[PDB]
Amino acid sequence: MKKKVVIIGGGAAGMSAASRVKRLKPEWDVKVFEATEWVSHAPCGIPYVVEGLSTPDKLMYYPPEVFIKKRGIDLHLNAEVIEVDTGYVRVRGGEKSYEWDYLVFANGASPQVPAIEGVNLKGVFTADLPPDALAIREYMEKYKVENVVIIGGGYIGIEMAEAFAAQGKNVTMIVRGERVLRRSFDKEVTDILEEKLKKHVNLRLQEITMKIEGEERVEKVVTDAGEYKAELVILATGIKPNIELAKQLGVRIGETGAIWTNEKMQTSVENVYAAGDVAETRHVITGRRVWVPLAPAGNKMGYVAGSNIAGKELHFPGVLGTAVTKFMDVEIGKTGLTEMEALKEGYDVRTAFIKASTRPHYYPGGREIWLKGVVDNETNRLLGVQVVGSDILPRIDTAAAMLMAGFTTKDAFFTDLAYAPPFAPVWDPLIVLARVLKFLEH
Amino acid sequence: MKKKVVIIGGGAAGMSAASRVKRLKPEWDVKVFEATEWVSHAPCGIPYVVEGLSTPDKLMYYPPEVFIKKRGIDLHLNAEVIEVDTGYVRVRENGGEKSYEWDYLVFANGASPQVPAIEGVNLKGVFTADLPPDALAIREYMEKYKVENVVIIGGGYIGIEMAEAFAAQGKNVTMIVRGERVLRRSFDKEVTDILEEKLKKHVNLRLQEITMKIEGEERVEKVVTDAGEYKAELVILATGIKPNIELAKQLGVRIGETGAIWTNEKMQTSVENVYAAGDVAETRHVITGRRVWVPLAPAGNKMGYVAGSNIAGKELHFPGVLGTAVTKFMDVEIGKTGLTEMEALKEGYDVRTAFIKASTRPHYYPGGREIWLKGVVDNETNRLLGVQVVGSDILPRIDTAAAMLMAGFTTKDAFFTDLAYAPPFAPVWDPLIVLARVLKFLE
Ligand SMILES: Cc1cc2nc3c(=O)[nH]c(=O)nc-3n(C[C@H](O)[C@H](O)[C@H](O)COP(=O)(O)OP(=O)(O)OC[C@H]3O[C@@H](n4cnc5c(N)ncnc54)[C@H](O)[C@@H]3O)c2cc1C
Ligand SMILES: Cc1cc2nc3c(=O)[nH]c(=O)nc-3n(C[C@H](O)[C@H](O)[C@H](O)COP(=O)(O)OP(=O)(O)OC[C@H]3O[C@@H](n4cnc5c(N)ncnc54)[C@H](O)[C@@H]3O)c2cc1C
Ligand SMILES: CC(C)(COP(=O)(O)OP(=O)(O)OC[C@H]1O[C@@H](n2cnc3c(N)ncnc32)[C@H](O)[C@@H]1OP(=O)(O)O)[C@@H](O)C(=O)NCCC(=O)NCCS
Ligand SMILES: CC(C)(COP(=O)(O)OP(=O)(O)OC[C@H]1O[C@@H](n2cnc3c(N)ncnc32)[C@H](O)[C@@H]1OP(=O)(O)O)[C@@H](O)C(=O)NCCC(=O)NCCS
Numbered sequence: 001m002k003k004k005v006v007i008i009g010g011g012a013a014g015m016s017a018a019s020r021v022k023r024l025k026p027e028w029d030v031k032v033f034e035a036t037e038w039v040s041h042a043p044c045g046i047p048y049v050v051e052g053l054s055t056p057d058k059l060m061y062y063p064p065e066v067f068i069k070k071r072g073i074d075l076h077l078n079a080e081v082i083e084v085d086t087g088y089v090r091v092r093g094g095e096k097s098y099e100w101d102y103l104v105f106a107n108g109a110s111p112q113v114p115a116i117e118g119v120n121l122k123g124v125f126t127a128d129l130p131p132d133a134l135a136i137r138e139y140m141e142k143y144k145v146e147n148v149v150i151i152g153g154g155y156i157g158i159e160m161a162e163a164f165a166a167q168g169k170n171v172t173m174i175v176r177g178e179r180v181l182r183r184s185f186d187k188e189v190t191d192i193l194e195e196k197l198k199k200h201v202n203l204r205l206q207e208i209t210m211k212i213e214g215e216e217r218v219e220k221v222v223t224d225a226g227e228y229k230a231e232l233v234i235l236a237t238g239i240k241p242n243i244e245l246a247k248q249l250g251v252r253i254g255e256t257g258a259i260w261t262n263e264k265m266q267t268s269v270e271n272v273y274a275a276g277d278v279a280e281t282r283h284v285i286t287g288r289r290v291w292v293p294l295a296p297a298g299n300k301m302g303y304v305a306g307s308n309i310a311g312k313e314l315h316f317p318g319v320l321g322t323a324v325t326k327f328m329d330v331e332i333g334k335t336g337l338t339e340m341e342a343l344k345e346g347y348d349v350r351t352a353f354i355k356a357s358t359r360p361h362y363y364p365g366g367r368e369i370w371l372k373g374v375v376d377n378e379t380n381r382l383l384g385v386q387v388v389g390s391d392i393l394p395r396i397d398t399a400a401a402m403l404m405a406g407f408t409t410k411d412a413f414f415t416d417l418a419y420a421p422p423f424a425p426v427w428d429p430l431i432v433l434a435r436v437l438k439f440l441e442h
Numbered sequence: 443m444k445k446k447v448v449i450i451g452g453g454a455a456g457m458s459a460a461s462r463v464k465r466l467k468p469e470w471d472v473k474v475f476e477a478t479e480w481v482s483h484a485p486c487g488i489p490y491v492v493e494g495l496s497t498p499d500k501l502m503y504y505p506p507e508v509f510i511k512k513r514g515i516d517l518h519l520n521a522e523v524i525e526v527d528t529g530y531v532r533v534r535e536n537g538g539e540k541s542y543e544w545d546y547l548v549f550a551n552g553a554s555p556q557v558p559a560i561e562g563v564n565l566k567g568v569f570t571a572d573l574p575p576d577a578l579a580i581r582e583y584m585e586k587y588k589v590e591n592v593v594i595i596g597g598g599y600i601g602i603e604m605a606e607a608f609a610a611q612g613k614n615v616t617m618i619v620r621g622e623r624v625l626r627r628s629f630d631k632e633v634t635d636i637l638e639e640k641l642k643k644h645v646n647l648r649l650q651e652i653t654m655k656i657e658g659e660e661r662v663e664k665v666v667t668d669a670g671e672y673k674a675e676l677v678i679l680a681t682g683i684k685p686n687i688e689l690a691k692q693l694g695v696r697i698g699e700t701g702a703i704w705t706n707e708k709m710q711t712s713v714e715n716v717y718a719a720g721d722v723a724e725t726r727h728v729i730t731g732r733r734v735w736v737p738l739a740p741a742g743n744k745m746g747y748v749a750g751s752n753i754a755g756k757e758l759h760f761p762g763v764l765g766t767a768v769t770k771f772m773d774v775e776i777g778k779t780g781l782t783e784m785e786a787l788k789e790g791y792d793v794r795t796a797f798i799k800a801s802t803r804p805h806y807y808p809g810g811r812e813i814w815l816k817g818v819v820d821n822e823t824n825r826l827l828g829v830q831v832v833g834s835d836i837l838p839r840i841d842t843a844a845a846m847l848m849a850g851f852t853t854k855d856a857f858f859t860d861l862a863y864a865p866p867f868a869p870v871w872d873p874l875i876v877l878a879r880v881l882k883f884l885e
Binding site: 012042044045048049053054055058059061284294295296297299300316317319320321322323324325326331333335360361362363364391393394395396397398400401402404405407411412413414415416417418419420421422423424426427428430431 | 454484486490491495496497738739740741744760761763764765768770777779837838840843844848851855857858863864865868871872875
């Protein structure tokens with residue numbers, strides 16, 4: 001029998017789920033309901049759209065007709081799913097009902113709303129979806145901005161901060177405690193991003209935002225600490241998964257806050273799946289259920305969800321917590337457990353923090369790179385690697401493979417990594433790190 | 443007790459071994475005999491010093507003072523090992539000869555360029571690019587004599603790296619390649635073709651030519667091949683290299699089928715207490731398990747490390763090599779790991795391949811260059827046999843793939859590996875992941 005598949009949300013995870021199902025089952029009716037004008041879009045591009053490095057149409061991978069005419073997917077744009085119950089969906093010109101044999105929550109995560117005064121003032125913005133990027137640029141046109149404040153010291157906030165310093169503004173970051181990205185990175189890595197950050201940005205640590213002032217336009221921001229002139233505000237205080245439709249069916253919600261899924265991306269409710277930013281996943285090292293709202297996993301989850309619906313078993317092994325960002329000259333990145341995390345999990349750990357060069361001592365253009373590694377004292381296995389400086393991608397990606405596989409410090413050392421003078425030093429920083437840790441054996 | 447450890451060769455392999463031994467056994471007598479004046483040197487920097495992009499003193503990692511004073515190695519510079527016998531080594535240093543007892547011996551005397559049977563190889567103006575003294579000799583010749591036209595006899599990596607060194611200096615460069623294509627021995631056609639496009643535009647690329655003779659006055663002026671003549675004031679012979687095994691043979695040391703000194707995981711040779719590390723040594727291949735010869739720097743260094751540890755009674759095993767290597771001509775990056783399609787087929791594998799094109803950034807973020815990937819896969823097990831990468835930003839794809847191959851990843855293992863994404867780094871689907879997907883998990 002043909003079967004009716006319904007997908008809520010037309011982002012990365014949603015279309016990956018949509019494509020996969022139709023690809024495997026062309027005779028099946030695959031509907032996607034997206035609330036906005038946007039499909040196959042990238043929230044990752046926003047900062048760079050706003051910076052103006054590029055345009056907002058380039059936050060699409062594929063246009064609608066590629067999905068409808070070229071891939072046979074019944075794509076409903078401007079369509080908001082408002083209710084769900086067993087076997088039925090309710091959507092909004094018009095408010096119609098649809099039946100499903102399978103359901104995918106490819107539903108994403110909306111930004112967290114801190115309840116303080118002036119949050120609703122023309123002038124205050126939160127960066128999540130592509131319509132937000134156009135709204136900020138449509139604003140900087142209708143008004144004249146020179147002072148910008150950013151509440152949040154995470155990555156979303158840093159990328160937005162950079163997106164304004166490049167446009168030559170007086171930017172102020174207000175983070176709620178002792179360091180930037182304290183939740184995800186360790187101090188000795190975070191310090192090196194901050195040296196560069198302090199300089200190009202008014203970094204205000206250990207502060208809480210109290211109110212936002214203005215008329216109908218924003219004009220000032222007050223914190224427990226001091227006042228700052230501001231004509232535009234970005235709020236990046238974290239995000240939370242859109243779980244409100246999920247509960248509508250008493251789908252299990254994870255310790256994490258996101259929708260509980262298994263290896264097949266199935267939920268606690270039969271024929272109901274979940275993928276992307278709404279979905280809680282598994283950690284590859286730890287085995288703990290964890291929430292890591294990032295793009296590559298989002299897509300893979302959609303791919304995995306699509307496959308199981310179309311009746312070919314596939315497992316998603318989980319995630320490593322691999323992530324990477326940048327402030328100007330400085331590349332920041334991790335994969336696996338941070339020292340803090342590894343401690344929280346009750347591991348017995350040793351660590352190492354080294355500096356190296358990015359090129360051999362002869363070939364020019366050699367820049368600095370720092371690496372912190374975390375190792376389990378009992379097994380010698382790597383638990384995580386953090387890298388900062390220049391040219392950190394080969395290291396992070398490489399270490400991610402090694403972790404996936406459960407490499408030891410010794411396994412890493414003898415791995416045949418490449419060397420040429422225009423590429424890396426003789427002793428690759430990753431294998432240097434792995435040597436400084438040592439291979440202990442009772 | 444307090445053993446005597448003698449190491450022939452002061453390159454990466456020798457110094458790694460000497461350092462390791464002394465580090466584990468500080469009460470031991472450790473001697474390094476190096477023929478030249480250079481210790482801890484980088485022959486890998488010869489092309490870049492020739493280009494003038496770097497000074498020669500930059501080829502040394504540590505000054506010899508560090509090994510002697512700071513580490514305790516009895517380093518003997520300008521000292522050549524002439525004969526080897528069980529227990530003894532004959533060395534020529536201060537014009538004369540002398541004798542040294544060894545309890546442990548390491549061959550780290552590397553590999554030297556193959557001397558071709560052409561007439562006129564010994565004219566002045568003809569150089570080999572193998573050791574640091576060569577790089578000086580090349581600059582000093584360009585200083586003493588006017589050079590406009592440069593001819594490279596090559597095809598392989600050194601050749602291309604030497605060819606580039608002369609081009610960006612404005613010189614007129616010609617490459618003589620025996621048979622169909624550049625780098626034909628180590629890469630597949632569809633990979634080298636992309637480099638070759640870039641080569642021909644900045645090089646007089648001459649394929650399927652056997653250089654017959656090098657002619658000139660007292661010094662070089664022309665190169666004659668069975669294809670024709672080429673005006674040349676300077677010649678680089680880079681037709682391949684051979685392991686220095688002639689003094690191993692005196693000891694009765696087993697030589698592997700590759701031509702290099704046979705070893706095991708411990709870097710031990712056929713002869714008791716005798717070791718070999720670096721470009722002299724034959725090692726294991728991580729995938730095939732076959733004996734292989736890959737004269738490259740990171741392996742040579744680890745081989746020295748491993749040899750040192752075993753001499754000093756701390757057992758360690760070198761797992762072998764993947765055939766991982768990387769080069770660049772201009773802004774074209776070329777690199778491989780594992781087996782090519784040709785190697786795999788030669789080894790009798792049931793093989794499927796894929797060749798894809800992608801970008802280094804997403805279509806929003808700018809600066810996106812082109813990247814091409816080739817993957818070889820075993821049909822029966824779904825495991826990656828090898829990956830070749832060409833274009834821009836290829837280091838992540840090779841290093842990551844190397845780890846995967848080292849470990850025995852399948853295409854599905856590769857596909858589901860948590861690789862990093864941010865716009866200034868890569869596209870949402872890393873080109874490696876696309877390769878793994880286009881390859882397929884057929885079972
Ligand atoms: C500014 C920013 C920068 C980022 N940078 C990176 C990065 O560098 N690297 C990285 O890996 N990740 C990054 N991410 C995260 C990445 O964008 C997400 O993890 C990924 O896009 C998740 O895809 P998704 O389809 O699951 O959710 P989304 O991409 O958010 O798609 C969900 C869609 O569902 C729609 N929807 C919501 N509710 C309904 C409803 N009730 N009815 C119908 N439709 C609905 C929404 O309109 C939305 O379009 C970034 C995110 C942001 C916000
Ligand atoms: C032009 C060029 C470019 C290269 N580029 C790269 C690259 O990009 N990446 C890479 O991984 N590898 C590269 N290599 C290879 C790399 O240099 C070698 O694999 C590495 O140096 C091997 O170290 P080794 O000590 O075994 O040999 P060597 O570094 O050559 O050391 C051997 C030493 O032993 C000495 N010796 C020889 N005979 C005697 C004797 N009779 N008595 C005493 N001493 C003796 C020699 O003088 C020599 O200094 C390149 C090589 C060349 C020539
Ligand atoms: C593109 C998207 C819809 C997924 O669709 P997908 O079909 O799984 O991925 P592709 O369109 O690239 O793949 C189509 C086919 O081409 C092949 N392919 C992809 N790239 C290729 C390449 N460069 N060379 C050769 N083949 C390629 C794939 O193998 C696939 O084959 P298959 O259908 O048999 O599996 C989804 O990832 C998306 O919405 N992306 C944009 C949004 C986003 O990811 N943003 C990032 C979050 S901020
Ligand atoms: C340098 C050489 C002698 C090896 O020496 P080594 O002692 O084994 O390696 P290092 O010099 O880095 O040793 C430094 C020590 O400090 C440690 N260290 C700590 N932090 C470090 C850092 N951030 N970077 C490098 N080493 C660090 C190393 O782990 C090592 O520890 P160990 O003594 O306990 O083993 C050898 O590689 C050589 O001669 N190289 C020159 C030629 C070459 O590199 N290649 C030739 C062709 S390109």
